[PDB]
Amino acid sequence: GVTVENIKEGNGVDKPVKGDNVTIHYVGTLLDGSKFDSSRDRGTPFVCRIGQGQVIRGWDEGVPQLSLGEKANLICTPDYAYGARGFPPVIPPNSTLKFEVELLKVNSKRA
Amino acid sequence: GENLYFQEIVSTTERVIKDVQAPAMYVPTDDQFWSKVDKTKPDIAFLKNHFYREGRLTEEQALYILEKGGELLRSEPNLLEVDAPITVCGDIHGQYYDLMKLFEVGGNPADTRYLFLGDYVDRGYFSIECVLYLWSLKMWYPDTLFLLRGNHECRHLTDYFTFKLECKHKYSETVYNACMESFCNLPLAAVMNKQFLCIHGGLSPELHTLDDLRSINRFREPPTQGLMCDILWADPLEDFGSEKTNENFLHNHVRGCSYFFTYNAACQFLERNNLLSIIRAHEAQDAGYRMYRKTKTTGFPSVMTIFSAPNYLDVYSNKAAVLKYESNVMNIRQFNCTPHPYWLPNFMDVFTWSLPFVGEKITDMLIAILNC
Amino acid sequence: GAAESSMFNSLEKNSNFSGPELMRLKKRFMKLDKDGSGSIDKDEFLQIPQIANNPLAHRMIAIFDEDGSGTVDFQEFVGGLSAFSSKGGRDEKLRFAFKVYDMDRDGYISNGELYLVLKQMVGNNLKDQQLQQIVDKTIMEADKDGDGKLSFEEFTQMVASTDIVKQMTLEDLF
Ligand SMILES: C=CC[C@@H]1/C=C(\C)C[C@H](C)C[C@H](OC)[C@H]2O[C@@](O)(C(=O)C(=O)N3CCCC[C@H]3C(=O)O[C@H](/C(C)=C/[C@@H]3CC[C@@H](O)[C@H](OC)C3)[C@H](C)[C@@H](O)CC1=O)[C@H](C)C[C@@H]2OC
Ligand SMILES: [Ca+2]
Ligand SMILES: [Ca+2]
Ligand SMILES: [Ca+2]
Ligand SMILES: [Ca+2]
Ligand SMILES: [Fe+3]
Ligand SMILES: [Zn+2]
């Protein structure tokens, strides 16, 4: 449902698991490349508890495929993003999202 | 009556973060808007701060700025003949607060001659401010400030991106349709100091002589193909100067329309039209500008790219640039971004942004109660 | 029982539920009330799994407590759930959302109220300066009488685009 494309290598040792607190910078683009949101817009990385339903299914299954420090391309089908409803003002229905993420921190271990 | 105080304490009865300025709540009056020196033009000094504080105009005020600027642009021909010295600027893309540092780096419009290559809207969430400001500037300095048309000064891309949403949000669709009809009056090219062709995009297989730019009917929307499209959309080939093809033009599979032009294509145009270089924008440069290969006849770079949007899209972390050109010396100055107020994606108000998460989590608990 | 009969027929007229449904709500109501005190305490609520790690737990309990006694009796338990009935009206669902941001229950949403409620849900993912700015613009666009506060009518004339009925409904429940 979600594909992980590697940009930059990680350490290949510290990978998130269910329950870990990750800190991720990202930039979200539609299939046409037009951006819809980015943590770098706000100059502050995004934090969440991965693998507990707190974020979309594309993240809850793709972040475990990362390692600390790795840059990646989370490409989520609508069934793993916002679906046939989409986000009312931002994400159109049936949209395939691309999150270019960078795993800056897992729990408290900095990269 | 309930009064809540949260623990150094703070109550709900006042603004929590005070160091951040509040927006301009009140539309300007007739004394604020109209200049005291000329009663037919806005006050640049007031507008600059009013827009800086995220202020807004009356619908009548915005329309007057777009229609009085449009009358000036319409009288100007398609191909401008501007004179040195001059400051040539690249894309600004709705980044109003960087446009403020641009004018400090390039010069005060009263003492300086400007040439923008278009792309004043979209991407940035302050696009109507850049337009209403520069259009007001055109009213004060119509002989010294010249504005050109980019591929975004149309109905096609503004509807596809963020500018049509912004006008609908900060003003009305009447302003938007007024903004689009005003864009159709923008000149398409410029010949600076009888040496450099100044456009937004690039060349075209239908662009042979400058007389072909003079024959364009610029009072329409950019077409799907042809001269008027490629002028605003064409890019230099990736391996420009180092090309592995003897072709003069190739299809632009990156933009989805128009063409790539090659070094041999640029040189032929400069040699036939007795020009020194091509000054354009379009492509964001990490260093704010980019010099392309030098011509075999004059040694001057065949193409120059100028980008004036620093920290493009708030993610690129690139530099901007302006072309301070005199005949003796060519100085390219670079500047860095400036903090701007925050907007939620697509001008979302707070409640549209937060209710889905509230509607989900409140529902999560109610379901958990019904299954004890 | 004449005592319980008065509270039953009363709730059958105000709530969007029916008699048979109110019996099932009384069942789960007593299933949480572990100390049999006739009400639910905040520690009794947070004793549930999904409720504990929920950023809107304290908001939900506060809205259920219509009188403000720190406890949710059955009359309040039924009142809070009625808004989420599939047979419930549109205006009922909007009022529950309004009460999420109206902490002092004074009928208006203020700059401080909005900032505090959001920061609790948002966290550090937004800078404090960024949340204050987007709160400033949201109020001035929604305010139409210049009071600097947001009434329920100004809140409805702003979330008209949002479909709250889909957000605030259970349907299969009860
Ligand atoms: C103020 C309180 C709200 C609270 C807002 C924040 C903490 C700020 C946070 C940076 C969100 C951004 O705010 C600028 C903005 O980020 C996006 O642009 C975006 O890049 C995105 O897709 N992200 C954000 C990064 C993690 C993945 C994904 C997400 O999982 O987002 C999650 C999401 C929306 C889940 C929905 C919930 C509703 C369900 O119905 C739906 O189920 C299909 C899934 C977010 C993190 C929620 O858990 C928490 C919130 O919503 C969304 C396009 C819209 C979203 O604004 C909401
Ligand atoms: Ca109890
Ligand atoms: Ca009570
Ligand atoms: Ca209040
Ligand atoms: Ca009000
Ligand atoms: Fe551009
Ligand atoms: Zn462009």
Numbering used by the authors:
A (entry chain C): 2 to 112
B (entry chain A): 25 to 31, 37 to 401
C (entry chain B): 2 to 175
What is written in the article reporting this PDB entry?
Calcineurin (CN) is a Ca2+/calmodulin (CaM)-dependent, serine, threonine-specific protein phosphatase that controls T-cell activation and is critical for numerous cellular functions. The CN complex is composed of a catalytic (CnA) and regulatory (CnB) subunit that binds Ca2+, and is activated by Ca2+–CaM2. Here we report the crystal structures of fungal CN ternary complexes with FKBP12-FK506 from highly clinically relevant human fungal pathogens: A. fumigatus, C. albicans, C. neoformans, and Coccidioides immitis, reflecting the common invasive fungal pathogens, including a mold, yeasts, and a dimorphic endemic fungus. Each complex has three components: (1) the CnA subunit with catalytic domain and the BBH, (2) the CnB subunit, with four EF hands bound to Ca2+ and wrapping around the BBH, and (3) FKBP12 bound to FK506, interfacing with CnA/CnB.
Crystal structures of CN–FK506-FKBP12 ternary complexes from four fungi were determined by molecular replacement to resolutions between 1.85 and 3.30 Å. Despite sequence variations between the mammalian and fungal counterparts of CN and FKBP12, the X-ray characterized ternary complexes reveal high structural homology. A flexible hinge in CnA separates the catalytic domain from the BBH, which forms the composite surface for FKBP12-FK506-complex binding. Fungal CnB structures are also conserved, with two well-resolved C-terminal EF-hands close to the FKBP12-FK506 binding surface and the two distal N-terminal EF-hands showing varying degrees of disorder, suggesting interaction with FKBP12-FK506 may stabilize the C-terminal EF-hands. The interface between CN and FKBP12-FK506 complexes is conserved across fungi, but differences are notable in the binding surfaces of FKBP12 and CnA in fungi versus mammalian proteins. While the CnA and CnB interacting residues within 5–8 Å of FK506 in human and fungi are conserved, fungal FKBP12s differed in 4 of the 17 interacting residues, as well as other residues surrounding the 40s and 80s loops.
